[PDB]
Structure formats: structure tokens, C-alpha cells
Amino acid sequence: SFSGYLKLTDNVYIKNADIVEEAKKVKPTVVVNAANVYLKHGGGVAGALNKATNNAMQVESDDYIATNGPLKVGGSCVLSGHNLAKHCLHVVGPNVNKGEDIQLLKSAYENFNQHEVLLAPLLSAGIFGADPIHSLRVCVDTVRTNVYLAVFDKNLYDKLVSSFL
């Protein structure tokens, strides 16, 4: 199971880890992707997860978009986890670098509540432009299921833990 995590709350855990390496190691039932509405996994966590699947995640995602159209900001879809997990929950947090409503971050985290346990990144953090400290606060105040957060950046992980209220 998950190892080396710091317990933040009853159900939220955090670790300084590369979510791809963490997924390959644990093979969780659900790995969360920091997706965009088009499921175009170009960079950040999405680009890294997709590259780990040898682009199979992108091929599957393009078929999903061709059939269903884009996701909503704050929405999600469950697709295959490929070699990383049983499932990948593609969750679209608001991208503040695209002027998207940061209030949609709570709606984005609500998708995690449909899964009993998840391996996840901080939504809207990194290249999505939101403050990761704010993302962690929304996560702990929204998610009620067991979430294991992987924070790639050591310095950010330390800042998140040391400032956690």
C-alpha cells in the first residue's frame, strides 16, 4: 500500500514524490490526473502520466473526447489507469493562467469523493497557476475519501507541510 506519507488529517496524506513513480510503485486503484477539458496531456502531471503510459493515455483520451466532447472545468471522467493504476480519474481544476474561476477548485476536488482511495496531485497547482497552499486547504476541506497527495517539488512539499494549519 502507500508508504512514507505524512498524515495531515483523518483522510488526507502527503508525500514528496513523483506521482508517476508513486503510481508505478503502488499501482493504486485510482490515480488522479491534473487534466484539462480537452484531455490534451501535454505537460505538468498530465504530460508526465501520459508519457509513462507510452501515449496510451492520450490515445484513449482522444477517443473519449471524440465521443463525448470536452469536460467541464471542475469536472472529471474515469478512464483506464494503463500501467499506472486500475483507473485514472482525469480531473479538471481551474487554470488561473487561462483566467478560470478559482472557486471551481472545490468542485474539482468533489470528484475525489466518488472514490474511496486515490493517489493524487494538488489540483490547479504547478502549471495551472493556483497557489498550492490554497489547493491543499481546499483539498482537506472538500475531500472526505482517503487521498494520498504526491508533491513533486521538495521545497514546495516542505512549505506545504510547515504552513499546514
Ligand X SMILES: CCn1cc(NC(=O)c2ccc(F)cc2)cn1
Interface residues with ligand X (CB under 6 A) are 126, 129, 131-132, 153, 156
Least separation in angstroms between CB 7 and ligand X: 22
C-beta separation of 125 from 116 below 8 A: no
Q: Which is nearer to ligand X, 16 or 111 (CB)?
A: 16
Closest listed residue to residue 73, CA positions, set 100, 109, 97: 100
Q: Count of CB atoms within 10 A of residue 13's CB?
A: 17
Q: Which is nearer to ligand X, 109 or 152 (CB)?
A: 152
What is 83-144 written as a DSSP string?
TT-SEEEEE----GGGT--TTHHHHHHHGGGGSSEEEEPPTT-GGG-S-HHHHHHHHHHH--
Least separation in angstroms between CB 20 and ligand X: 17
Least separation in angstroms between CB 53 and ligand X: 23
Least separation in angstroms between CB 43 and ligand X: 12
Q: Which is nearer to ligand X, 32 or 160 (CB)?
A: 160
Q: Which is nearer to ligand X, 78 or 156 (CB)?
A: 156
